[PDB]
Amino acid sequence: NATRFASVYAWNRKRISNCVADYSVLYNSASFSTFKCYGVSPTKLNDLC
């Protein structure tokens, strides 16, 4: 929901530690234009610390 992002080399990073970021809000399913994923989806991150 951010207004604008930075460049490719200027990328903005927000560091939030611990195993889980957020399991409540998941847009990973067919909510956006293009999905190219590796590993597990954000839905499966609930079991990974």
Binding site: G39, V40, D47, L48
Partner: protein, 49 residues
């Protein structure tokens, strides 16, 4: 491989992608176990002598 722990491979890569890294762990451990058994058979001939 990526990690020596199989659970790290199963919890990360997809089932089609995990088969690549799991085969590296199995084949490596088969060679590590076969080398052990081969060395034990050699020591078996020494202890029987």
């Amino acid at each position: 491989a990526i990690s020596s722990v199989l659970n790290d491979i199963l919890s990360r890569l997809d089932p089609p992608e995990a088969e690549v890294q799991i085969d590296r762990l199995i084949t490596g451990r088969l060679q590590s176990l076969q080398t052990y058994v081969t060395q034990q058979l050699i020591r078996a001939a020494e202890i029987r002598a």
